[PDB]
């Protein structure tokens, strides 16, 4: 359990994937040339998880970059740290998917998918002990969502014993005007319920709300949003990247957080919330971080945690602080707020501390929750889906590429089924 | 009445009668011994033969005990051996069947993709 | 002669093995190279011709992290590399992966190394097995090992030192599933199991030693002192010695009732500025110094084994024991006329310098079989029922080939065991 | 009838057997190098009943030392008179017995026994006329009781015409070393009933009670108990070791003391009672009936004496002794049996025990000895009713039938001792 | 010549043998080395080609320490090794071991050494057998010997001197068993048995000799003076009891009632001279009888008086006349009321340095009184006390005896006591 193979697909996928690689590179003392320039062996101890060791004492991200649109690859290579990526792990195609799930999943995406599988075979056979895969993508578009879930199931077919983990960005009409995003999202959700082990739910609605309400950015850009995504991705992979008292891996997380195979969609949370490139004039206290972590404003999914109950919680604190004080306040929040933890999963809140802070913050905390309150996100998608599908709105965009009304009907009841079992366990009695 | 009896170098004897009697007048082979002695020996040897016989019965019980415990160990080993091989084979078969089911559903899905691509060509 | 093979399984088992074997070396004057300047240490230390003394131990872990620290640590030369066995993938906190999927790939290798250790023995007493209940290796690979040890060595003695899980220091939420599963499968194969509650050790290091947040090294080094008291009767020549068979015979009234309760005294802070035989003996029956959280005052004693070490004379033990059997608070069962077994070894308890415990002249560790330990089984069983009622997490075990039937059977066996601790306390 | 072969087995067997040789070597004048330098020839007349003469004007006890554990006999070798024993008479295994009768009698005992019998056979053949065997062992442990009773049975098979004599220490919860003492003692009494000719009942209960109550020792130690046992063992072998008009031996002892073959368990007594470190003849006589002076925890005025042997040691009037003995018997008429006339024989021997001017030693066959067995019986039933610790014995191959037959036998011996307590003329 | 052979069986039989031969050697002038400075002594002493006088005697004790006294004793030179017979294990106070186990093993050896002494006899009268009632060798082997002697030497006389058990100084609780066993088995094969009650002898030593705790040797010295007086007129040329058959003729009118009562006087302490009439009065005191019983509870069948030393016939009948007047001595109806008297002029001799004092005159009275049956009644009762519960029987049975022999022997003893009461 060491090496992870990373895949980023489509515009959203490649842009949040890029920012992930910049961020953990700075944390790990790697410059865009690929050279280590840091001051701690701790930055290098577990570096094999994401980076291949290279000639010249270089380091190259174990990363595969994918898009049907040729433009995003040039934008990544132009981007800071664009040169760090293996040039042969760039797989690109001729035309976009036109925000069409069926184009990415069934037609054009299927032409490119074999080529992607070749790059994946190489990076994974060069691995001593392959944990599995992490995928960044959107669900509203056509490539990251439609070819993204195609790729997932094809990787499943070859590597059925490795963990399949995704960072999946959820659409919001606040951030994109493209009307068929509820369809693309409900199609993708179907495939994810069936074929991934862990999915962090990164909600564009929540990201826009944070930027508008807490960051007073009147007109937030994808860069304003992706700062929040990049902070979370750093936070939830800290315990893979850095040595700790538990040797976290993707499978130990899946085993301790997912009590039922379908309920594997996590609600991530971060504190403190900041704007990109903004000096922090004073950090926060540990009890502050603890409280603000179970605060609806600090969630990357647009759900109020006090509207459901947590099945499992994992909490990562970063910075120099007393683990005594941390476990203290953490237990306090559990006792004062006992009605929001399921009774029939004992000791279901695990917390870790890592002395190494993220760039620009003296102290941070990061929250990975499996809350039934996540049904709100899916209900919102289902409502938008039904609004359009009652009218059979835009359905010929998909039947033209070969699909059938039944596949739609199916993915809706499956999401609705998902909603109802999140409810089953929310109302479940220990007695 | 004294009646002289005898006299000699170192002795003299006689008899004194005070009153005469009221009334006048007066009112195993070597084989049998050897047989009785040999008989006592025979039953002596028989009881000693009974004592050693009941002592020899005790030795056989002691071997039966050591034997039983050896049989118990061996039967414990054999039961554990069959338990483990049954469990490990059932677990392998179960695991292999779950993995077979996981790959069959995915394969039904990639059959559907070929069917979806067919309808597009049709129209 | 009279050799004992120690086997350390998974993280907890291995990390405790470190503290123990370290302490043994100091108690017998063995340098980390295995050479030294009372030949009783031969029960645990074979000897190569060079005068090197090699522990009779196999360390096993399904992941190489913990055991790679031993391979690179202070005692890297203490062991042969073939005794330190690791795979590449741990059991991800999953019994079914420690017992089947991952466990089966390394089980043959471990038994071969054990077989070779048994070949260097002329009078093998048995096996001591160190493991956690909650770890996926601690649970499922120890079960597999126990089952495999019973086929290779029949009824030969098998004793456990087991870590009972605690919320404060847990690392996994499926730990009650792991605990009940390995207990069901190991029950038939273990002659005697010494249980250690991480919560109890934790609360002792906090009250008696004034460590705010004890680390594993803190917990483990106190757990070592206890293990040393148990094995000193085999590693040293003292006035009153107890071998492995005397342990099983004097502490286990029934084959399933084989879970003695450990206590130790004195536990005093090194920095704070001597205690009599009576005082440390009385302290074994106070619930504060228990190694498992339970109330023996609400239970009946079936067998008390007291193992003294240091400057302790037999008169003052019998005087201390005299006082104990007058305490109505300490209740034995109808069917136990004689309940006490006593041993005395004369080498004071050795303390690792740079550690937190103080050097004392005399100390004692009691093992008592009380019906009170059933409270600890009741606590695990209830955490199990919470999750199992909703089948929480069960898919992870089914996916690795297990069946739901194994869960219910294991729980039903725990239910019988709970009822057995009830029946034996009847007057 | 000259030479006795002495055997000690197990921890207790070997601890008290070592003090025995310690004591009687002091009496006969033997230093630990084996050299003799006392000042009387009466110390050497019948010294060949216990010692072989080595050529170097030395003397070597005719003593075989046995344990399944190596530790105990290494402590004897290093004890005071460890120099004196023939070094090749140490027969020791190394797995120990684990406090289990079934291990000493069946499995581990079997594998050491023929090595013991070979040492026995070689001491026997160097004997002009072999009188028999004296064995020292505990009944409560694994070796002295499990392996001891096995030894007994196999010596009786090789030497059916020779007397078998044991010193058998009885367990008490008051000084215990293992929780299964009732099982070990009861399985062993069954053996003893059927295969020994004379057994002296050494009760750890009576030893403890004497140290605590009479000798006022707050917390008795094994040394305190073994100080009583050593004084007793010296007293009962006095007439075998020192010549008197009786010319005593073990077969005549058994013929005059055992009216019925099963009833061969004796209550030993001693007076005065002394602690380690630190009196008239009429009073010496009376301590015969004091239960405070008994080494089995039984009250002699609870039953009747079938037969009694008393040894008086020291300078004292054989007229005054005989007077006071008869006066005791007349005054306590009701506690001797009518149907055995003249059932109290007294020997007086001029040689006093060390540190004492006047001592008396009593050997009694009393129906009161049933109390010792009834107490072992009750402890046995308290455990066996629940099958406590039974699986350790069944695991060694024993059926549980052997357990019931061993107590049904020991209850029969109790009812047999009772049957004669009530028998009249 | 009129030769008599002595056989000594068991410890009591042997240690009394030493005291007698010691006394004989002093009475006849034989030194301990064998040399001698009336030829009647030759009835009890053969001669060697070396000039030494060798007792006609066999000692049988299967315990070598007792025979070792003889072979290392003061008179060791007198005896020849073929006369001393020993073994390894004694009878362990068990008649049955003495009669059946040992006896099968040594009877031929013992009879063989006896045959060697009889071949040196031109006219053998018979045997004098010394043994205990109580020991297992004295009872068990002696009875077998007497059976064998009755077969091998048909019409030869067989006298025994039997030590009768006293609880004061006795060694075993089973002595009543061995007494009734040997008496039953010896009864047909003995012509005259003088019993010696160890308690009677004990009482006499304490009162008359001022010994508070008499030793076996004090008793044996006194017993020898009795044996001497009985045998005196066989070893000198006397007039009364000059051959062994004359004992049976003068004292045993009925064959089964062949147990006479011996009475001796004077017993005078050396630490401290009596007349013929007072030593004669002393013969009718129960305090001087060898067996404890009251001659007023029975009638006499015969009565002989054996004077030794300086005693004159007129004095004797004068002492006899005084007794008729004042005392009553009821004889049976079918027998004459009166005495046979012998004087042997050779003076009574003591061991020098002993506790018996040299006296000028003595007397020993032998009488056959029905009162002796009280001795057999006393033992009969102890026998029944123990045989009722079968106490100690298994030791005898384990030696190959049958239980029924106990009952057979007891019934014979019942028969004997009825015989004694019928004549009385
Ligand atoms: N947070 C975030 N969301 C993004 C970003 N880019 C696109 N999205 C969201 O992604 C959804 C559309 O997905 P795309 O990334 O444009 O789709 P694609 O997979 O690249 O496919 P095509 O562009 O059609 O070839 C909408 O909901 C957008 O708001 C980004 O950089 N950050
Ligand atoms: N006392 C003590 N307990 C420990 C230690 N390490 C782990 N534990 C306990 O063991 C349980 C977790 O088991 P582990 O031994 O870490 O797991 P493992 O056997 O290595 O198995 P996997 O990691 O799942 O492959 C929890 O209750 C931990 O607190 C330790 O060093 N000392
Ligand atoms: N007068 C007298 N009586 C004796 C003497 N020795 C033993 N007795 C008595 O004889 C009886 C026992 O007879 P013993 O002849 O000594 O026995 P044993 O047959 O030689 O010996 P065992 O074969 O051991 O039975 C007891 O009443 C003794 O007191 C002795 O020297 N003189
Ligand atoms: N009197 C006395 N009893 C002892 C001594 N040692 C042990 N015992 C008793 O012996 C029993 C245990 O037997 P032990 O000899 O130690 O066991 P073994 O070596 O297996 O035969 C218990 O009843 C103890 O009280 C001793 O030295 N003296
Ligand atoms: C409900 O109780 C638990 C929750 C989570 C976890 C555990 C128990 N125990 C484990 O051993 C694995 N584990 C975790 N795993 C990963 N994995 C990395 C991939 C994110 N991160 C983290 C944790 C906890 C802190 C961050
Ligand atoms: C009930 O009467 C008896 C009891 C015991 C014994 C005897 C008679 N007589 C014997 O010759 C053997 N014997 C004895 N043996 C040993 N040894 N010691 C002693 C005696 C008695 C004095 C001490
Ligand atoms: Mg682990």
From D329, D346, D369, give the residue that closes a domain: D369
- D243, D135: one domain: yes
**The pair of three-digit structure tokens given for residue E49, joined into one six-digit string:** 């080609």
How far off is chain D from E177, nearest CA to CA, in Å? 12
Cβ atoms within 10 Å, residue E248: 18
Residue C86 phi, psi (nearest 5): -140, 150
- D106, D93: one domain: yes
- The answer to whether the CB of E173 falls within 8 A of the CB of D341 is yes
Is B116 within 8 Å of A157 when comparing Cβ atoms?
Answer: no
- DSSP assignment of C31-98: -TTS----GGGGGTEEE-TTS-EEESEEEEESSSHHHHHHHTSTTTTTS-GGGEEE-SS--TT-HHII
Of D202, D194, D188, D166, whose CA–CA distance to D4 is shortest? D166
Beta bridge partners of E85: E60
Residues contacting residue E382 through CB under 8 Å, at least 6 positions apart? D341, D342, E176
Rounded Cα distance between A252 and A250, Å, is 6
Rounded Cα distance between E327 and E103, Å, is 49
CA C190 from centre of chain: 12
What's the first-to-final CA gap in chain D, in angstroms? 36
Rounded Cα distance between E295 and D241, Å, is 46
Residues contacting residue B53 through CB under 8 Å, at least 6 positions apart? none
CA distances from A147 to A85, A235, E168 (A): 21, 27, 123
**The pair of three-digit structure tokens given for residue D23, joined into one six-digit string:** 């004591």
Where would I find the beta strands (DSSP E) of D333-395? 344-349, 359-366
**The pair of three-digit structure tokens given for residue D256, joined into one six-digit string:** 């005059």
Of C8, C396, C379, C388, whose CA–CA distance to C167 is shortest? C379
Rounded Cα distance between D342 and E381, Å, is 13
Residues contacting residue C21 through CB under 8 Å, at least 6 positions apart? C55, C57, C75, C78
- The answer to whether the CB of C342 falls within 8 A of the CB of C312 is no
D163-170 and D198-203 strand pairing: parallel
Report the half-sphere exposure of B115 (CA within 13 A, side-chain side): 9
Judged by its nearest atom, the ligand closest to the C-alpha of residue D340 is 6
E337-344 and B11-19 strand pairing: antiparallel
A364-371 and B2-7 strand pairing: unpaired
Rounded Cα distance between E338 and D24, Å, is 65
Assess whether the C-beta atom of E274 lies below 6 angstroms from ligand 3.
no
Beta bridge partners of A367: A269, A315
CA D385 from centre of chain: 31
D3-9 and D130-138 strand pairing: parallel
CATH number of A391's domain? 1.10.287.600
Rounded Cα distance between D143 and B73, Å, is 23
CA distances from A22 to A85, A201, D171 (A): 11, 21, 80
CA dihedral C283, C288, C290, C294 (to 10 degrees): 130
- Specify the 3-state DSSP secondary structure of E269: strand
> Measuring from atom 3 of ligand 3, which residue has the nearest CA?
E12
Residues contacting residue A304 through CB under 8 Å, at least 6 positions apart? A296, A373, A376
CA distances from D362 to A287, C328, D284 (A): 85, 40, 10
Distance D140 CA to ligand 4 centre (A): 7
> Using the 8-state DSSP alphabet, how is residue D146 labeled?
I
In chain B, positions 34-63, which contact chain D (CB-CB < 8 Å)? 48, 51-52, 55-56, 58-59, 62
CATH number of D49's domain? 3.40.50.1440
- The answer to whether the CB of A253 falls within 8 A of the CB of C94 is no
- Specify the 3-state DSSP secondary structure of A174: coil
Q: Which long-range contacts (CB under 8 A, 24 or more apart) does A352-355 make?
A: A352/A239, A352/A244, A352/A245, A352/A246, A352/A248, A352/A314, A352/A315, A352/A316, A352/A317, A353/A316, A353/A317, A353/A318, A353/A321, A353/A323, A353/A326, A354/A238, A354/A239, A354/A242, A354/A244, A354/A316, A354/A317, A354/A318, A355/A319, A355/A320
Ligand 2 atom, smallest distance to C61 CA: 20
- The answer to whether the CB of A25 falls within 8 A of the CB of A84 is yes
Rounded Cα distance between B31 and B11, Å, is 45
Residues of E in contact with D252 (CB under 8 A): 92-93, 172
C198 assigned ligand-binding residue = yes
Least CB–CB distance from B117: residue in A150, A195, A402: A402
- D86, D204: one domain: yes
* H/E segment holding residue A26: helix A10-27
Is A255 within 8 Å of C90 when comparing Cβ atoms?
Answer: no
Residues contacting residue E57 through CB under 8 Å, at least 6 positions apart? E5, E6, E7, E8, E17, E21, E79, E83, E117
E269 assigned ligand-binding residue = no
Rounded Cα distance between B23 and D142, Å, is 83
Of E272, E263, E276, whose CA–CA distance to E222 is shortest? E263
CA distances from D210 to D227, D228, D273, D374, E209 (A): 11, 9, 8, 20, 47
**The pair of three-digit structure tokens given for residue E413, joined into one six-digit string:** 């003893």
| Elucidation technique | X-ray
In chain A, positions 184-243, which contact chain B (CB-CB < 8 Å)? 194-195
Rounded Cα distance between C348 and C361, Å, is 6
- A264, A305: one domain: no
Supply the angle between the helices E175-186 and E136-152 in degrees, to the nearest 10: 10
b/e per residue, D332-362, with b = 16+ CB within 10 A?
eeebbbebbbbbbbbbbbeeebeeeebbbbb
Of D388, D355, D265, D365, whose CA–CA distance to D310 is shortest? D365
> Which one of E11, E69, E88 would you pick to mutate in the ligand 3 pocket, going by the greatest count of ligand atoms within 8 A of its CB?
E11
- Helix, strand, coil % in chain A, rounded to nearest 5: 50, 20, 35
D222 assigned ligand-binding residue = yes
CA distances from C89 to C10, C105, C112, C279, C316 (A): 12, 11, 21, 49, 53
Outline where D332-367 has alpha helix (H): none
Supply the angle between the helices E103-118 and B30-122 in degrees, to the nearest 10: 160
> Measuring from atom 13 of ligand 6, which residue has the nearest CA?
D253
Least CB–CB distance from B88: residue in C96, C104, C400: C104
Rounded Cα distance between D279 and A70, Å, is 120
Least CB–CB distance from D339: residue in E89, E386, E394: E386
Residue D269 phi, psi (nearest 5): -140, 160
Rounded Cα distance between C347 and C350, Å, is 8
Chains D and A touch (3+ CB pairs under 8 A): no
Residue C89 phi, psi (nearest 5): -130, 125
Chains B, D: CB contacts within 8 A come to 36
- A353, A233: one domain: no
Rounded Cα distance between A97 and A13, Å, is 14
What's the first-to-final CA gap in chain C, in angstroms? 43
CATH number of D331's domain? 3.30.1330.20
Q: What angle do CA D381, D387, D392 make, to 5 degrees?
A: 120
Rounded Cα distance between A341 and E85, Å, is 107
Assess whether the C-beta atom of C10 lies below 6 angstroms from ligand 2.
yes
Rounded Cα distance between A375 and A307, Å, is 10
Rounded Cα distance between A180 and A158, Å, is 32
Rounded Cα distance between D142 and D161, Å, is 28
> Measuring from atom 6 of ligand 1, which residue has the nearest CA?
A12
Residues of C in contact with B73 (CB under 8 A): 154-155
- The answer to whether the CB of A427 falls within 8 A of the CB of A339 is no
Is E93 within 8 Å of D252 when comparing Cβ atoms?
Answer: yes
> Which one of D198, D309, D351 would you pick to mutate in the ligand 6 pocket, going by the greatest count of ligand atoms within 8 A of its CB?
D309
Identify residues whose C-beta is under 5 A from ligand 7, the ion: C 11, 90
Least CB–CB distance from C245: residue in D98, D181, D221: D98
Our count of domains for chain A comes to 3
- Specify the 3-state DSSP secondary structure of A247: coil
Per the rule left: phi > 0, alpha: psi between -120 and 50, beta: everything else, C104 is alpha
Judged by its nearest atom, the ligand closest to the C-alpha of residue D256 is 6
Task: Report whether the peptide linkage leading into residue A272 is cis, meaning its omega lies within 30 degrees of zero.
Answer: yes
Assess whether the C-beta atom of E197 lies below 6 angstroms from ligand 3.
no
Distance A197 CA to ligand 1 centre (A): 23
Of D159, D153, D168, whose CA–CA distance to D131 is shortest? D159
Burial class (CB in 10 A: 0-12, 13-18, 19+), C217: middle
Outline where A126-180 has alpha helix (H): 148-158
- A192, A84: one domain: yes
- A101, A64: one domain: yes
Written in H, E and C, the secondary structure of A268-300 is EEEECCCCCCCCCCCCCCHHHHHHHHCCHHHEC
Is the Cβ of C427 closer than 8 Å to some Cβ of chain D?
no
Resolution (A): 2.7
Of A359, A206, A366, A353, whose CA–CA distance to A280 is shortest? A359
Rounded Cα distance between D307 and D328, Å, is 14
Rounded Cα distance between A136 and A67, Å, is 12
Cβ atoms within 10 Å, residue E168: 14
Burial class (CB in 10 A: 0-12, 13-18, 19+), D328: buried
- Specify the 3-state DSSP secondary structure of E94: coil
Rounded Cα distance between A431 and A344, Å, is 9
Beta bridge partners of D201: D168
Q: What angle do CA E293, E294, E300 make, to 5 degrees?
A: 105
Per the rule left: phi > 0, alpha: psi between -120 and 50, beta: everything else, C87 is beta
Residue A184 phi, psi (nearest 5): -50, -35
How far off is chain E from B24, nearest CA to CA, in Å? 6
**The pair of three-digit structure tokens given for residue D241, joined into one six-digit string:** 């070791």
- A67, A214: one domain: yes
Residues of A in contact with B113 (CB under 8 A): 105-106, 110, 150
- A197, A333: one domain: no
Of C427, A213, B40, whose CA–CA distance to E144 is shortest? B40
Residues of D in contact with C314 (CB under 8 A): 221-222
**Which of the following is catalytic: C69, C246, C279, C409?**
C246
- Helix, strand, coil % in chain C, rounded to nearest 5: 45, 20, 35
- The answer to whether the CB of E220 falls within 8 A of the CB of E288 is no
How far off is chain D from E12, nearest CA to CA, in Å? 12
What's the first-to-final CA gap in chain B, in angstroms? 179
CA C350 from centre of chain: 19
- DSSP assignment of E112-127: HHHHHHHTT-SS--EE
Rounded Cα distance between A57 and D369, Å, is 92
Structural domains of chain C ordered from first start: 3-251 (3.40.50.1440), 261-374 (3.30.1330.20), 375-425 (1.10.287.600)
Chains D, E: CB contacts within 8 A come to 69
In the block, tokens 């996994």 appear at: C172
Residues of C in contact with B85 (CB under 8 A): none
**Which of the following is catalytic: E69, E147, E199, E246?**
E246
Q: How many residues does chain E have?
A: 424
CA distances from A244 to A240, A248, A318 (A): 9, 8, 12
- The answer to whether the CB of C411 falls within 8 A of the CB of C380 is no
Is B102 within 8 Å of A160 when comparing Cβ atoms?
Answer: yes
> Which one of A8, A9, A10, A268 would you pick to mutate in the ligand 1 pocket, going by the greatest count of ligand atoms within 8 A of its CB?
A10
Domain that holds residue D403: 370-422
CA C327 from centre of chain: 29
How far off is chain D from E406, nearest CA to CA, in Å? 16
Cβ atoms within 10 Å, residue A35: 14
Breaks (C-N over 2.5 A) in chain B follow: 27
Residues of C in contact with A309 (CB under 8 A): none
Per the rule left: phi > 0, alpha: psi between -120 and 50, beta: everything else, C25 is alpha
Rounded Cα distance between D116 and D151, Å, is 8
Q: What angle do CA E415, E419, E421 make, to 5 degrees?
A: 115
Rounded Cα distance between A198 and D331, Å, is 99
**The pair of three-digit structure tokens given for residue E40, joined into one six-digit string:** 């009647």
- A394, A343: one domain: no
Is B52 within 8 Å of D397 when comparing Cβ atoms?
Answer: no
Task: Report whether the peptide linkage leading into residue E374 is cis, meaning its omega lies within 30 degrees of zero.
Answer: no
- A256, A368: one domain: no
Beta bridge partners of D163: D132
In chain D, positions 210-249, which contact chain E (CB-CB < 8 Å)? 245-247, 249
- A176, A312: one domain: no
Least CB–CB distance from E213: residue in D1, D318, D342: D318
Outline where E187-312 has alpha helix (H): 198-209, 216-235, 244-251, 276-282
Is the Cβ of B97 closer than 8 Å to some Cβ of chain A?
no
From D238, D268, D298, give the residue that closes a domain: D268
């Amino acid at each position: 359990m060491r090496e992870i193979v990373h895949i980023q697909a489509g515009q959203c996928g490649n842009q949040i994937g890029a920012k992930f690689w910049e961020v953990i590179s700075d944390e790990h003392g790697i410059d865009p040339t690929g050279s280590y320039h840091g001051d701690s062996d701790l930055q290098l101890e577990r570096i094999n998880v994401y980076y291949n060791e290279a000639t010249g004492n270089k380091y190259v991200p174990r990363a595969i970059l994918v898009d049907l649109e040729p433009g995003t690859m040039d934008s990544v290579r132009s981007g800071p740290f664009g040169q760090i990526f293996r040039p042969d792990n760039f797989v690109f195609g001729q035309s976009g998917a036109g925000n069409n799930w069926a184009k990415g999943h069934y037609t054009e995406g299927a032409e490119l998918v074999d080529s992607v599988l070749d790059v994946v075979r190489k990076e994974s056979e060069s691995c001593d002990c392959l944990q599995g895969f992490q995928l960044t993508h959107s669900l509203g578009g056509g490539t990251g969502s439609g070819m993204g879930t195609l790729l997932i199931s094809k990787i499943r077919e070859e590597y059925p014993d490795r963990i399949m983990n995704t960072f999946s960005v959820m659409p919001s009409p606040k951030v994109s005007d493209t009307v068929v995003e509820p369809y693309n999202a409900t199609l993708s959700v179907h495939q994810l319920v069936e074929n991934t082990d862990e999915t962090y739910c990164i909600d564009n609605e929540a990201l826009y709300d944070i930027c508008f309400r807490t960051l007073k950015l009147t007109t937030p850009t994808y860069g304003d949003l992706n700062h929040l995504v990049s902070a979370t991705m750093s936070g939830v992979t800290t315990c893979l990247r850095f040595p700790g008292q538990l040797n976290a891996d993707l499978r130990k997380l899946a085993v301790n957080m997912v009590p039922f195979p379908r309920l594997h969609f996590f609600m991530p949370g971060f504190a403190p919330l900041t704007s990109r490139g903004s000096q922090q004039y004073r950090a926060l206290t540990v009890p502050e971080l603890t409280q603000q972590m179970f605060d609806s404003k600090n969630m990357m999914a647009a759900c109020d945690p006090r509207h459901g109950r947590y099945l499992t919680v994992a909490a990562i604190f970063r910075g120099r602080m007393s683990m005594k004080e941390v476990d203290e306040q953490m237990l306090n929040v559990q006792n004062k707020n006992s009605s929001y933890f399921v009774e029939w999963i004992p000791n279901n809140v695990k917390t870790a501390v890592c002395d190494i802070p993220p760039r620009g913050l003296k102290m941070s905390a990061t929250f990975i929750g499996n809350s039934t309150a996540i049904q709100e996100l899916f209900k919102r998608i289902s409502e938008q889906f039904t609004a359009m599908f009652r009218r059979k709105a835009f359905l010929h965009w998909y039947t033209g590429e070969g699909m059938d009304e039944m596949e739609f009907t199916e993915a809706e009841s499956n999401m609705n089924d998902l909603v109802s079992e999140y409810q089953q366990y929310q109302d479940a009695t220990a007695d | 009445e004294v009646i002289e009896l005898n006299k000699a170098t170192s002795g003299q004897s006689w008899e004194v009668i005070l009153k005469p009697p009221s009334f006048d007048g007066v009112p195993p082979s070597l084989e049998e011994i050897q047989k009785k002695l040999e008989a006592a020996e025979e039953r002596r040897k028989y009881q000693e033969a009974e004592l050693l016989k009941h002592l020899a019965e005790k030795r056989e019980h002691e071997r039966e005990v050591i034997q039983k415990a050896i049989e118990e160990n061996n039967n414990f080993i054999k039961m554990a051996k069959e338990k483990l091989a049954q469990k490990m084979e059932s677990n392998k078969e179960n695991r292999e069947a779950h993995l077979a089911a996981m790959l069959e559903r995915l394969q039904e899905k990639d059959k559907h993709a070929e069917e979806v691509r067919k309808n597009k060509e049709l129209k | 002669m009279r050799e004992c093979i120690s086997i350390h399984v998974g993280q907890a088992g291995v990390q405790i093995g470190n503290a123990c074997w370290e302490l043994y070396c100091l108690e017998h004057g063995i340098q980390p190279d295995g050479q030294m300047p009372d030949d009783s240490f031969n029960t645990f230390f074979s000897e190569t011709g060079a005068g090197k003394h090699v522990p009779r131990a196999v360390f096993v872990d399904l992941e190489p992290t913990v055991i790679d620290e031993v391979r690179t640590g202070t005692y890297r030369q203490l062991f042969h590399p073939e005794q330190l066995i690791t795979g590449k993938e741990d059991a991800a906190n999953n019994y079914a992966r420690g017992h089947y999927t991952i466990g089966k790939e390394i089980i043959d290798l471990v038994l071969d190394r054990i077989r070779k250790l048994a070949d260097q023995c002329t009078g093998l007493q048995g096996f001591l097995v160190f493991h956690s209940f909650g770890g996926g290796t601690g649970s499922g690979f120890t079960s597999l090992l126990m089952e495999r040890l019973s086929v290779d060595y029949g009824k030969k003695s098998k004793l456990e030192f087991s870590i009972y899980p605690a919320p404060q220091v847990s690392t996994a939420v499926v730990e009650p599933y792991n605990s009940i599963l390995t207990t069901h499968t190991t029950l038939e194969h273990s002659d005697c199991a010494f249980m250690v509650d991480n919560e109890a050790i934790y609360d002792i290091c906090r009250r008696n030693l004034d460590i705010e947040r004890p680390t594993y090294t803190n917990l483990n080094r106190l757990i070592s002192q206890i293990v040393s008291s148990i094995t000193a009767s085999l590693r040293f020549d003292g006035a009153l010695n107890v071998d492995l068979t005397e342990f099983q015979t004097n502490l286990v009234p029934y084959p399933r009732i084989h879970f003695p309760l450990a206590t130790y005294a004195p536990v005093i802070s090194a920095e704070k500025a001597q205690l009599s035989v009576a005082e440390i003996t009385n302290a074994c029956f106070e619930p504060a110094n228990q190694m498992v959280k339970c109330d023996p005052r609400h239970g009946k004693y079936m067998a008390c084994c007291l193992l003294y070490r240091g400057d302790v004379v037999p008169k003052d033990v019998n005087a201390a024991i005299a006082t104990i059997k007058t305490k109505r608070s300490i209740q034995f069962v109808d069917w136990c006329p004689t309940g006490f077994k006593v041993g005395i070894n004369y080498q004071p308890p050795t303390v690792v310098p740079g550690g937190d415990l103080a050097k004392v002249q005399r100390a004692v560790c009691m093992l008592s079989n009380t019906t009170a330990i059933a409270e600890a089984w009741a606590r695990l069983d209830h955490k199990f029922d919470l999750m199992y009622a909703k089948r929480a997490f069960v898919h992870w075990y089914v996916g690795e080939g297990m069946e739901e039937g194994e869960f219910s059977e294991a729980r039903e066996d725990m239910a019988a065991l709970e009822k057995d601790y009830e029946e034996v306390g009847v007057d």
